[PDB]
């Protein structure tokens, strides 16, 4: 079993119509195969674009590849590799990941917290009846409150200016955080603001100052006899020790990861989903029929309705396939000498899963470039199915998403409540939203407007 050297690609030329980096590397697989590497100075990066090899990296050898590479921008955002998402493997990451996951067991109620913020969201949108608006902000408020309650048992009231403070440093960090090491090899894709690094520090300081103020004030509120939220879980763990792993700054960075991920991922997917529905009125009408028939207008949707709003479930699965939140996940790193397929991978090598490539494998999916929720239903439309093994929207293995349950609950309920109450149409001017996307740390959609109107079937 002597392993082979990885294919090494010496240069990455400009190629027309290749779009974003994840599609560019995907298309290069036709010439170099499903796994190949590039070198920058002393650092080697391997890109993996087939599900079998990806599952080896993520699952079968998940521990070998559970590291995270060091990057200047990621260092800034994670306060030098604290927190969860950008923390290297080891004792700090394992502890804070375990505690974050333990916190979600205290909400088994999650549906109730979410529905309360969605009702406020719908009330706010109904006030704009007849207008064409960007719904980013209202949705941002609802999911921000959900995660604030999970983290602190606090919620913001409509109009609180802190919501705008958070939205603006969120946008500022995301716009200046580059997680793609290879960008310098494909300079025509390196798109960042003028003074990127200082602007990133500027916005991160704002975030760190606000969270530290919350955490410091929370020391006065914490009691060991009531552990109901994430900061409680972290503070109790410090007391009950490990104690060096739970520094104030470690706790602050972990809270920051959850606070940011809990808002920017789900808000993005909601916007993507609505955009796809504006481009596919046929699907939208079938979603209205499904909800009117299985829920009606007597009551509001609940999580139990996931068993009967099957096309809605399929639509979300299809958005997560076609515009993945993380089309190249978060970069991995080999913690030890290891292997992928028949190839040797040295300790320290950066390993990137091209999830875009998995989600557009023409041999594992039928017409992968088009929005077809029905691929996740049987022919009758009566049961959800998994048509492909090349589908990993939340990752897998040791570094898999820890917010999946929350995300799926938020996405289902938000969409269901919105479809029950509102007609969602293209604006008066013809403008449809661009589906091209903006490949930042989250795969964002260009801002767009939607004509929203209370459905008159919802008259009473
Ligand atoms: C909304 C749809 C979401 C999708 C599709 C998604 C998917 C993903 C993916 C692909 C990764 C990277 C896996 C890897 O590096 O191998 C990830 C990591 C992560 N996600 Fe999500 N996520 C979503 C929402 C959320 C939410 C709502 C939260 C928290 C409330 C969250 C928290 C995290 C964290 C902390 C990590 C890093 C885990 C680690 O590095 O150990 N995500 N997620
Ligand atoms: C930058 C941002 C969002 C902007 C915040 O102000 C800072 C921040 C903290 C954590 C990051 C998050 C973006 C999404 C990240 C990167 C994320 C993530 C990414 C994709 C899927 N699930 C989670 C995990 C940690 C999250």
- SS3 letters across the chain: CCCECCCECCCCCCCCCCCCHHHHHHHHHHHHCCEEEEEECCEEEEEECCHHHHHHHHHHCCCCCEECCCCHHHHHHCCCCCCCCCCCCCHHHHHHHHHHHHHHHHHCCHHHHHHHHHHHHHHHHHHCCCCEECCHHHHHHHHHHHHHHHHHCCCCCCCCCHHHHHHHHHHHHHHHCCCCHHHHHCHHHCCCCCCHHHHHHHHHHHHHHHHHHHHHHHHCCCCCCCCCCHHHHHHHHHHCCCHHHHCHHHHHHHHHHHHHHHHHHHHHHHHHHHHHHHHCHHHHHHHHHHHHHHCCCCCCCCHHHHHCCHHHHHHHHHHHHHCCCCCCCCCEECCCCEEECCEEECCCCEEEECHHHHHCCCCCCCCCCCCCHHHHECCCCCCECCCCCCCCCCCCHHHCCCCHHHHHHHHHHHHHHHHHHEEEECCCCCCCCCCCCEECCCEECCCCCEEEEECHHHHC
Are 86 and 67 spatial neighbours (Cβ–Cβ below 8 Å)? no
> What domain range includes position 251?
1-460
How far is the C-alpha of 147 from the C-alpha of 410, rounded, in Å?
11
CB-CB neighbours of 57 under 10 Å: 28
Put the strands of the sheet holding 422-425 in their side by side order: 132-133, 450-454, 422-425
Please report, for residues 30, 200, 357, 360, the alpha-carbon distance to residue 45 in angstroms, rounded to integers and kept in the order given.
Answer: 19, 25, 17, 22
Are 259 and 147 spatial neighbours (Cβ–Cβ below 8 Å)? yes
Are 242 and 95 spatial neighbours (Cβ–Cβ below 8 Å)? yes
Pocket test for ligand 2, best of 442, 443, 444 (most atoms within 8 A of CB): 442
How far is the C-alpha of 149 from the C-alpha of 280, rounded, in Å?
35
How far is the C-alpha of 246 from the C-alpha of 309, rounded, in Å?
43
How far is the C-alpha of 414 from the C-alpha of 205, rounded, in Å?
32
How far is the C-alpha of 428 from the C-alpha of 426, rounded, in Å?
7
Distance 402 CA to ligand 1 centre (A): 6
| Smallest-distance ligand from the CA of 325 | 1
- 142 token code pair: 């609802």
Closest CA to 406 of 254, 262, 232, 258: 262
Domain count, the chain: 1
Q: How far apart are the first and last CA of the chain?
A: 70
Distance 258 CA to ligand 1 centre (A): 9
User: How many Cα atoms within 13 Å fall on the side-chain side of residue 279?
Assistant: 16
The method of structure determination was X-ray
Closest CA to 354 of 18, 16, 29: 29
Q: Is 122 annotated as a binding residue?
A: no
Closest CA to 162 of 231, 211, 216, 202: 211
| Smallest-distance ligand from the CA of 169 | 2
Contacts of 87 by beta carbon, 8 Å cutoff, 6+ apart? 68, 78, 81, 93, 96
Distance 177 CA to ligand 2 centre (A): 10
**What residue ranges line ligand 1, CB within 6 angstroms?**
84-85, 97, 257-258, 261-262, 265-266, 269, 320, 325-326, 329-330, 393-395, 399-403, 406-407
Residue with tokens 């997560």: 320
- 298 token code pair: 């007597």
**Maximum Cα–Cα distance for the chain, whole Å?**
71
Q: How far is CA 35 from the centre of its chain?
A: 24
Name the residue with the closest Cα to ligand 1, atom 21.
401
Round the CA-based radius of gyration of the chain to a whole number and report it: 22
Q: Is 170 annotated as a binding residue?
A: yes
Question: Which atom of ligand 1 is found nearest the CA of 68?
Answer: 40
Distance 258 CA to ligand 2 centre (A): 8
Interrupted after residues, the chain (C–N over 2.5 Å): 108, 241
This structure's resolution (Å) is 1.9
How far is the C-alpha of 139 from the C-alpha of 30, rounded, in Å?
40
Name the residue with the closest Cα to ligand 1, atom 31.
403
């Amino acid at each position: 079993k002597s392993l082979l050297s990885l294919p090494l690609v010496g240069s990455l030329p400009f190629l027309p119509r290749h779009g974003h980096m994840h599609n560019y590397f995907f298309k290069l697989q036709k010439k170099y195969g499903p796994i190949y590497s590039v070198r920058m100075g002393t650092k080697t990066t391997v890109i993996v674009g087939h599900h079998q090899l990806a599952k080896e990296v993520l699952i079968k050898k998940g521990k070998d590849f559970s590291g995270r590479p060091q990057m200047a921008t990621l260092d800034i955002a994670s306060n030098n590799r604290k927190g969860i998402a950008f923390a290297d493997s080891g004792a700090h990451w394992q502890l804070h990941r375990r505690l974050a996951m333990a916190t979600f067991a205290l909400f088994k109620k999650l549906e109730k917290i979410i529905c309360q913020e969605i009702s406020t969201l719908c009330d706010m949108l109904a006030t704009h009846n007849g207008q064409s608006i960007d719904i980013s902000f209202p949705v941002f408020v609802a999911v921000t409150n959900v995660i604030s309650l999970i983290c602190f048992n606090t919620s913001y009231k409509n109009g609180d200016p802190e919501l705008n403070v958070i939205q603006n440093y969120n946008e500022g960090i995301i716009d200046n955080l580059s997680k793609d090491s290879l960008v310098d090899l494909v300079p025509w894709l390196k798109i960042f603001p003028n003074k990127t690094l200082e602007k990133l520090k500027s916005h991160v300081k704002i975030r760190n100052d606000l969270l530290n103020k919350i955490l410091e004030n929370y020391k006065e509120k914490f009691r060991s006899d009531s552990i109901t939220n994430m900061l409680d879980t972290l503070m109790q763990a410090k007391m009950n020790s490990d104690s060096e792993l739970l520094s104030d700054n470690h706790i602050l960075t972990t809270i920051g990861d959850i606070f940011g991920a809990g808002v920017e991922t789900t808000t993005s997917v909601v916007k993507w989903t609505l955009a796809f529905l504006l481009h596919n009125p046929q699907v939208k009408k079938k979603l209205y029929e499904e909800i009117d028939q299985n829920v009606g207008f007597s009551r509001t949707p609940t999580i139990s309705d996931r068993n009967r709003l099957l096309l809605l479930e399929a639509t979300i699965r299809e958005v997560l396939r076609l515009r993945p939140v993380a089309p190249m996940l978060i970069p991995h790193k080999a913690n030890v000498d290891s292997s992928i397929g028949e190839f040797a991978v040295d300790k320290g090598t950066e390993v990137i899963i091209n999830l875009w490539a998995l989600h557009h494998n023409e041999k594992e999916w039928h017409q992968p470039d088009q929005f077809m929720p029905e691929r996740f239903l049987n022919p009758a439309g009566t049961q959800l199915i998994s048509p492909s093994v090349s589908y990993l929207p939340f990752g897998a293995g040791p570094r898999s998403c820890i917010g999946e349950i929350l995300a799926r609950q938020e996405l289902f309920l938000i969409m269901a409540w919105l479809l029950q109450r509102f007609d969602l149409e293209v604006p008066d001017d013809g403008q449809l939203p661009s589906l091209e996307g903006i490949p930042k740390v989250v795969f964002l959609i260009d801002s767009f407007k939607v004509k929203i109107k209370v459905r008159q079937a919802w008259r009473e």
